[PDB]
Amino acid sequence: SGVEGAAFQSRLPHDRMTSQEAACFPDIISGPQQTQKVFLFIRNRTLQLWLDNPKIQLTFEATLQQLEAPYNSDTVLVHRVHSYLERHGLINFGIYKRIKPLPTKKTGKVIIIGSGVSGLAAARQLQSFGMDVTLLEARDRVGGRVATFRKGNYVADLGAMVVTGLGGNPMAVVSKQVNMELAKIKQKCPLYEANGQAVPKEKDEMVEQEFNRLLEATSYLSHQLDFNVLNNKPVSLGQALEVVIQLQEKHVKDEQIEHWKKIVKTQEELKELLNKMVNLKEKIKELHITAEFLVKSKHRDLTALCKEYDELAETQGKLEEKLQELEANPPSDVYLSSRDRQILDWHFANLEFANATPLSTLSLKHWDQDDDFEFTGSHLTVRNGYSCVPVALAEGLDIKLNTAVRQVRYTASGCEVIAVNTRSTSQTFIYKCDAVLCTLPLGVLKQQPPAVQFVPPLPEWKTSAVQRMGFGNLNKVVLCFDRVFWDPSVNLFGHVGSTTASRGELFLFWNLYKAPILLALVAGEAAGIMENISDDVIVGRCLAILKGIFGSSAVPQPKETVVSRWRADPWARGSYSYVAAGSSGNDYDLMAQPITPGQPIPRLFFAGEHTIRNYPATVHGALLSGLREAGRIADQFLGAM
Ligand SMILES: Cc1cc2c(cc1C)N(C[C@H](O)[C@H](O)[C@H](O)COP(=O)(O)OP(=O)(O)OC[C@H]1O[C@@H](n3cnc4c(N)ncnc43)[C@H](O)[C@@H]1O)c1[nH]c(=O)[nH]c(=O)c1N2C=O
Ligand SMILES: [Mg+2]
Ligand SMILES: [Mg+2]
After folding, report:
1. Backbone phi, then psi, for 376, in 5-degree steps?
2. Contact 15, 5 (CB under 8 A)
3. Most buried of 91, 117, 196, 276 (most Cβ within 10 A)?
């Protein structure tokens, strides 16, 4: 269905009210069931109208005109649903043509720190709600962790680059709006060992299968057996993995031992049967009244011994057969060979890439707490660089670039934000406002020697959440060539590293369809460490790997190279949050919580990828967090109309 799909596209249940809807419509949820289904149909249809054409504003008027004929008479209820959906950024979000323009007089002043996707999304909302909005951005560009390299015909994304499925993803709407073409990522990812040799199909699938079983087993240990605490310390995913690996190695040693015992037993039995057979032979030997009765007597005596000997020879045959059968079918000598382990490490590296951190830092219990909210559909890349999104969202907004915020003061009567110019650190600005929306990356909030001061320091419940949460790292080397020397039918191929410690080093190479660019990813422990290597040396290390795979003559010098260093970047201090051991999804809720000065009204608000528990560490999460806070701020200052 269309209306059912609209709800789904909006991350809502089509056939029931959410608790947030319950709060805003207490009369509906406590009323007759018939009216609840009217509510849901109006909601689902209003969403559909928006999603069918998100390039224009969906007004209350137009919703009412397009509703069919009992519902177009629910005038008041339709207005209430429209208002709710609009306020919460489920319709009329992103970039679209306004039908009713903004009042020239603006109500309330909001300073937004950061113009990444969350700041930009929030700003458009607050602006379209008729508030006065200024964004202060430290960089000489918008977009933050959406960072596109553009030079000549080369386009490459240094930050976010993947749209993780369209089904339920608000980036589907934003992409439609900016005419951003999306292409599917082909799944085939052949692996090459450190020497350049392809990993054959059979091996690849065996090791991948083991990877999945190992992960499944940690999930079992955590959520079925509750193995989440050791030595009064929360257990990490990495820690649990090594425990599961040790158990597998033990199992292999056990079955090996049992086999050796069966062999030794059978060897013993043979030896002992040989002995008595040797002695029976010696008894046959030393067996060498009428003459004729003596002849008969020796005959029956001797054939009694030969019948005895045949019985034993039969058992000799059965034992030698059993022995040969055991020596032919031993079980595995090892759980994983050195080579097998290295390949398994590639899969671990890949997981460290997705989570932006070594596995030993991830919470066993909570690392994947957000899996339940993953979107449906194939994962996609952007045709002409992801920066099209924040650039488009910036249109019409008041953005102060090269303006690094240093102090935030907030009181029961208002707020002040002090910033400095980053080209001339002498000149300092003071910005007055009724509300501050903080979109500083978690890494910036963690910074020791702090980058930004809060007068009233942030309360302990906030700072302890900041401290508990992980902020990861992940980097890329962009290699721009004259020609495609790799297979154009693969988007991805893997480099199996030499050690466990260095498994994340240039472990994955990425290409977009028919562009002469390779992206080499640096993940896990290698990510932070490799930042201390100059571009030339790291590019050199890339070329060496590529030469080992494609041939030392098939690989030309790159025309252009770029290398991200997200941890060293002072405006990021890493790539994105991860659920650290000792933290949980709750810390994301805590990060989202506004601060009241000390009934004083809330003054300091928080958005960004680290403040949304269901969608952290993503562009859509950043976007949704922005819509959320805009909603809450407008409710505070313009009333929950
Ligand atoms: C290498 C890499 C890869 C991926 C992703 C990320 C990365 C890095 N991420 C995360 C998102 O980029 C991020 O969550 C979001 O952009 C944050 O979006 P966000 O939560 O809005 O954070 P931001 O850092 O973009 O915005 C904060 C802004 O604040 C500015 N700022 C900082 N200090 C300031 C100050 N003192 N004063 C004023 N402004 C200041 C800073 O320059 C920046 O513009 C992905 N996202 C996604 O969906 N698909 C992906 O492929 C990926 N990707 C990998 O997997
Ligand atoms: Mg197993
Ligand atoms: Mg090493």
Report:
1. -95, 155
2. no
3. 117
Residue 362: which of 572, 577, 591 has the closest Cα? 577
CA–CA separation, 130 and 481 (whole Å)? 48
Atom 1 in ligand 1: residue holding the nearest Cα: 159
User: What is the C-alpha separation between 136 and 111, in angstroms, rounded?
Assistant: 7
Shortest-distance ligand to the CA of residue 345: 3
Tokens of 548: 């080992």
Torsion over CA of 176, 177, 183 and 184, rounded to 10 degrees? -50
Atom of ligand 1 nearest to the CA of 609: 20
Which ligand lies nearest to the CA atom of residue 116 in the structure?
Answer: 1
- Taking ligand 2, which is a single-atom ion, which protein residues have CB atoms under 5 Å away? 213
- E-strand ranges in 158-281 read 162-163, 182-184, 191-192, 229-230, 233-234
Residue to mutate (ligand 1; options 140, 352, 576, 588; most atoms within 8 A of CB): 576
Q: Is 162 annotated as a binding residue?
A: yes
- Please tell me the experimental approach by which this structure was elucidated: X-ray
CA separation for the pair 358, 241 (Å, rounded): 12
Residue 115, annotated ligand binder? no
Confirm whether residue 591 is marked as ligand binding.
Answer: no
